[PDB]
Structure 1
Amino acid sequence: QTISPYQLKFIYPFWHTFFARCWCKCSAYAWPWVWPGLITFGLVKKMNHDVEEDIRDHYWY
Structure 2
Amino acid sequence: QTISPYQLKFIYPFWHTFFARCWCKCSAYAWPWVWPGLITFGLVKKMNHDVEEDIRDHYWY
Question: Which interval holds the TM-score relative to the shorter structure?
Answer: over 0.9
1:10-55 deviations in Å (ceiling 9; x for gaps): 0000000000000000000000000000000000000000001011
**4+ runs deviating over 4 angstroms:** none
TM-score, reference length from structure 1:
0.98
Query: Separation in 2 of the partners of 1:48 and 1:35?
Result: 21
Report deviation, 1:5.
Answer: 0.2
For structure 2, which runs of at least 5 residues remain unmatched after alignment? none
Aligned equivalent of 2:30? 30
Whether 1:9 and 2:9 are equivalent positions in the alignment is yes
What number of residue pairs does the alignment pair up? 61
Q: In structure 2, what is the Cα distance between the partners aligned to 1:30 and 1:39?
A: 13
Report the identity percentage. 100
Backbone CA RMSD of aligned residues:
0.4
